[PDB]
Design a binder for this molecule. Sequence first.
Ligand SMILES: *[C@@H]1O[C@H](CO)[C@@H](O[C@@H]2O[C@H](CO)[C@@H](O)[C@H](O)[C@H]2NC(C)=O)[C@H](O)[C@H]1NC(C)=O
Ligand SMILES: *[C@@H]1O[C@H](CO)[C@@H](O[C@@H]2O[C@H](CO)[C@@H](O)[C@H](O)[C@H]2NC(C)=O)[C@H](O)[C@H]1NC(C)=O
Ligand SMILES: *[C@@H]1O[C@H](CO)[C@@H](O)[C@H](O)[C@H]1NC(C)=O
Ligand SMILES: *[C@@H]1O[C@H](CO)[C@@H](O)[C@H](O)[C@H]1NC(C)=O
Ligand SMILES: *[C@@H]1O[C@H](CO)[C@@H](O)[C@H](O)[C@H]1NC(C)=O
Ligand SMILES: *[C@@H]1O[C@H](CO)[C@@H](O)[C@H](O)[C@H]1NC(C)=O
Ligand SMILES: *[C@@H]1O[C@H](CO)[C@@H](O)[C@H](O)[C@H]1NC(C)=O
Ligand SMILES: *[C@@H]1O[C@H](CO)[C@@H](O)[C@H](O)[C@H]1NC(C)=O
Ligand SMILES: *[C@@H]1O[C@H](CO)[C@@H](O)[C@H](O)[C@H]1NC(C)=O
Ligand SMILES: *[C@@H]1O[C@H](CO)[C@@H](O)[C@H](O)[C@H]1NC(C)=O
Ligand SMILES: *[C@@H]1O[C@H](CO)[C@@H](O)[C@H](O)[C@H]1NC(C)=O
Ligand SMILES: *[C@@H]1O[C@H](CO)[C@@H](O)[C@H](O)[C@H]1NC(C)=O
Lengths: 50, 454, 50, 420, 49
Amino acid sequence: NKKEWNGMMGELLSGQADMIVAPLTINNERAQYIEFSKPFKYQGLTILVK
Amino acid sequence: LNIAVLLGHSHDVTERELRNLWGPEQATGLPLDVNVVALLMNRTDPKSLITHVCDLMSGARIHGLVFGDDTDQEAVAQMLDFISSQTFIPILGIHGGASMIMADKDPTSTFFQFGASIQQQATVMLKIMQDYDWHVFSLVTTIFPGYRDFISFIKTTVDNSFVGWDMQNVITLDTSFEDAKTQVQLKKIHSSVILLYCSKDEAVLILSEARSLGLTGYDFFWIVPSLVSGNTELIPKEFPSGLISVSYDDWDYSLEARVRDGLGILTTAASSMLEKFSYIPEAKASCYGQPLHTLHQFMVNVTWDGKDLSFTEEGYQVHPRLVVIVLNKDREWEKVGKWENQTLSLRHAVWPRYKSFSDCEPDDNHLSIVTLEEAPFVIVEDIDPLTETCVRNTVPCRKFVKINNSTNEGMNVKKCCKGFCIDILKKLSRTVKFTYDLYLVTNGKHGKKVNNVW
Amino acid sequence: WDMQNVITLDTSFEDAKTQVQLKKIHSSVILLYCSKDEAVLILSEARSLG
Amino acid sequence: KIVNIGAVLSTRKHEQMFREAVNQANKRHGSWKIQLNATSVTHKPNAIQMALSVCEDLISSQVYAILVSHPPTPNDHFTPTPVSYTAGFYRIPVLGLTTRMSIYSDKSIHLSFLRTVPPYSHQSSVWFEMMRVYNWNHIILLVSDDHEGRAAQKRLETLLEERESKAEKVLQFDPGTKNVTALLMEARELEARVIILSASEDDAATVYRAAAMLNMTGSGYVWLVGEREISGNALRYAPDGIIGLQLINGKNESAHISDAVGVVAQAVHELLEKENITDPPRGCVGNTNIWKTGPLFKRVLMSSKYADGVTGRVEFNEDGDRKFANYSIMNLQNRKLVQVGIYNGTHVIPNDRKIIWPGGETEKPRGYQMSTRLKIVTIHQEPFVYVKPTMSDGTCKEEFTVNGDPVKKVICTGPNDTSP
Amino acid sequence: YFRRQVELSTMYRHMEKHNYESAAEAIQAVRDNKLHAFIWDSAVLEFEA
Ligand SMILES: *[C@@H]1O[C@H](CO)[C@@H](O[C@@H]2O[C@H](CO)[C@@H](O)[C@H](O)[C@H]2NC(C)=O)[C@H](O)[C@H]1NC(C)=O
Ligand SMILES: *[C@@H]1O[C@H](CO)[C@@H](O[C@@H]2O[C@H](CO)[C@@H](O)[C@H](O)[C@H]2NC(C)=O)[C@H](O)[C@H]1NC(C)=O
Ligand SMILES: *[C@@H]1O[C@H](CO)[C@@H](O)[C@H](O)[C@H]1NC(C)=O
Ligand SMILES: *[C@@H]1O[C@H](CO)[C@@H](O)[C@H](O)[C@H]1NC(C)=O
Ligand SMILES: *[C@@H]1O[C@H](CO)[C@@H](O)[C@H](O)[C@H]1NC(C)=O
Ligand SMILES: *[C@@H]1O[C@H](CO)[C@@H](O)[C@H](O)[C@H]1NC(C)=O
Ligand SMILES: *[C@@H]1O[C@H](CO)[C@@H](O)[C@H](O)[C@H]1NC(C)=O
Ligand SMILES: *[C@@H]1O[C@H](CO)[C@@H](O)[C@H](O)[C@H]1NC(C)=O
Ligand SMILES: *[C@@H]1O[C@H](CO)[C@@H](O)[C@H](O)[C@H]1NC(C)=O
Ligand SMILES: *[C@@H]1O[C@H](CO)[C@@H](O)[C@H](O)[C@H]1NC(C)=O
Ligand SMILES: *[C@@H]1O[C@H](CO)[C@@H](O)[C@H](O)[C@H]1NC(C)=O
Ligand SMILES: *[C@@H]1O[C@H](CO)[C@@H](O)[C@H](O)[C@H]1NC(C)=O
């Protein structure tokens, strides 16, 4: 009855990785567990249509 | 092999039906040296228990022990664990303290029980709470063991909940009550239900305190497991009317059927292990002056006569028959709900409240609210088919849907509701502080006086 | 202004309902109106209740 | 006209001083007008007849607290279980004296089984105090067993929650195997050298042979073990310079049981201060009426405060153990135990000796490397992470931009597709 | 981020039926008119525009 992680966090927290350089979607859930960095890119959200 | 079945006085079970429990049974007998020993005993003290265990183990190497306890001592089964740590014989605890919710077994133990763990029973009770939408709930626990995993499972369920449960911190009872600070904790009650986890005499004390203080109202419901309620042959004093209990001791599926299923599982495991290994009878010689081919990792996926009686890794049944009972004003325990192998069936769909429980009772705070489906205002959709949960910005409703045109019978189908007037009613319930009873009209449209008939 | 509702005390404390009324207080400024010895008792209970 | 005190006891001079402690308890509280008697049972290897002797000598005795006093048993099971299992039939607390296992520290199986010793997990707190001595954060945990290992891991998680920090890597495995050397090489690949070990004797000998095989006893390594790892061949196979613990008055059996009998006697006289004194019923003949002053006796015993003791200020905690015991910190200098520290209730005091480490100097090895090699992982992002297969074998097509700048590439490793 | 917010449950239930593995899957799907819209970071969609 416990939630876990996967992906880049699942490979980082397992010790298989050391540092993640990626388009890290900064939120509040990940900051409760790991530490962040100061962002190099500033970017929001939008919708792509035809 | 040789199986000795001893009992006490539970369910008024005599001995002659145990003598008749072997004759027509085991018709295709590939084990040949199978004999049954039916015994009874008044004394349920551990001295006579060890005495009869040594007598039956010295009694021509009996490899099967079946016992049902009639007392309220679960540590007897732990005593059986000490028997399971010395005899190394497959032993089954059947009734009472031999099959209560015990704490933890051992890898060196070959003892098993009827029933499930406390986590599956907690899952059944939370499924009841999901089906009845009582999101306002309590958790009152004493220091009676088996509580850390239970409260931890509740916390991991609420922390991983797609429902949005409203939870207060755990009300804890340390010692025997002073009625000075534990009274404040009972006045720190979280509304709309009371969940309790304690022993039997602790349940007597807590229900006596709640009856003396008046914590048994129409809003404060009482939902308890079998470990709080106790055994079924005796019903103690000072119980509130409307005590929902979750147990597995059935009177229809009685003790004779349970010991017949236990004998069937033992003979099935013996006939399945005899075809693999030859020298199956291998037990301890005698208790005075102190095995590999065992049934510890062989009879896990056992099923006799289609009965869902597979074994767990913790020493329980995977999907046992759970029975949810209530208490009326006539001091009787009547079956209400049963549990399927994946779902939870509810016979009494219209949930009773058992109004004869106390002296004074108003029909306040619950307002009968009816509406009609209009697209910008009243959006009514089905519940989630995978989780059975309305999302918390929607509200439940019931609809009296008639089945077909010939019959007059109708069911109360519960459906989710979002929309404008839903938000209006929720903000009115935030401000005016009234609880809503939302349902739909089944007569038809809004309203018209059809010749002095509305 | 943000005025919490009026907490009323009848007499000397029962320690069954007065503690419940003092747990209702969540503000910063407590406006107490009683006698001198009742003020000593209420400050002693508030020190006991933190 | 007597009240019996039950003990599972071997040596007869200890029976004599046990009766002397009963006499010293009878000297005080002169207004108490009923007498005491002692009962003790000896070594029997057959545990069924041990439980038989327990149920024949303690049910018909009306005891208040039972003392099991056999540490050096030749059986490797080490089971004081039937005494507590017999006394839990009426919820009677047995005060243990010998073992420190988490299975006996459990409130779940054992209902109210107290003792006078703390479990080994508090040693991790002492190890956390070692984390307060050398100011070290990145730790490595290796536990052989799983019963005590879950409790030790939970206690270490509580300790790291108190700092609001986390461990680097924890490990549990099957006690008895030999090929955990790959996990030890993975621990060598970690950025710390704090080696915390929880193991039995054979598991400690196995990991010492694996450490000597992999040369894990060089410079920087922080070796720190408990009590089972300095006994038998684990005492022999330990490297010269390993740091171990020692229980003050742990192997001192006589003074510890004397202080325990003093605690038991003062708890009995404190229980007799109030009313509703119910004897344990004679359950041998048809009696299962439960001893309902069990939680009353637990309220007395779990709140029993003391100030006297040869071992020190003994007091029961929330689990019924020893509060704030002074410990010893030993070093293995050329296969010789050398005392290098003492431990207060919450503080470590090193003595004037030299803390000799298995690496170089006696100064503390800062085993936190600067992480020269790092590990980078990323997801295939289209404008960010262009992943392209090689031309022939491991080569990259060094192409230019529109301004003559070559695109600086890197050699990565990635899978073909998804798992289906 | 949309699962946290209290009124975005409807778009959550809409998007959970057609969850795609990579973003280029959604790019080719909206290119071949399999989709109609896609929630994504802004400058990456500007780059692909
Ligand atoms: C109890 O478990 C049994 C076995 O898993 C279920 O019986 C199966 O039901 C499905 C249809 O729902 C059939 O396709 C299988 O063939 C059945 N297996 C057998 C041999 O019984 C049963 O549905 C579960 N529910 C109950 C009645 O508790
Ligand atoms: C136990 O198992 C480990 C892991 O497989 C062994 O370590 C490797 O063994 C292989 C040969 O099987 C060697 O080629 C590697 O060089 C070893 N690893 C390293 C980095 O040393 C280990 O040898 C086994 N030990 C025993 C008991 O034989
Ligand atoms: C023994 O038999 C009696 C008959 O009245 C019954 O009440 C009791 O539960 C049994 N158990 C004991 C105490 O031995
Ligand atoms: C028993 O069932 C479990 C779960 O399906 C499975 O893991 C195990 O392999 C089965 N054992 C047998 C008898 O094959
Ligand atoms: C009654 O209605 C249900 C659908 O609601 C249908 O499946 C069933 O066949 C109907 N029964 C009869 C006999 O009308
Ligand atoms: C149902 O039965 C009634 C009987 O009068 C009939 O008028 C109606 O057409 C039937 N059809 C429906 C609405 O199911
Ligand atoms: C104490 O009990 C033992 C038996 O356990 C008995 O031999 C002894 O005489 C008793 N002593 C007194 C005087 O109570
Ligand atoms: C110690 O063991 C390692 C294992 O790879 C080996 O490489 C090294 O040469 C050995 N000798 C030393 C330097 O201690
Ligand atoms: C220490 O233990 C010994 C037994 O080895 C015991 O005789 C002595 O009383 C104990 N007390 C001291 C002196 O620390
Ligand atoms: C002793 O028991 C009686 C009866 O239950 C009770 O009235 C009394 O308060 C108890 N004594 C104490 C000090 O609790
Ligand atoms: C243990 O340490 C305390 C100080 O915390 C000291 O007072 C006491 O004497 C020590 N124990 C013994 C028995 O020497
Ligand atoms: C004892 O523990 C205290 C806790 O404050 C600590 O300050 C002190 O250094 C320790 N040593 C002694 C024996 O005073």
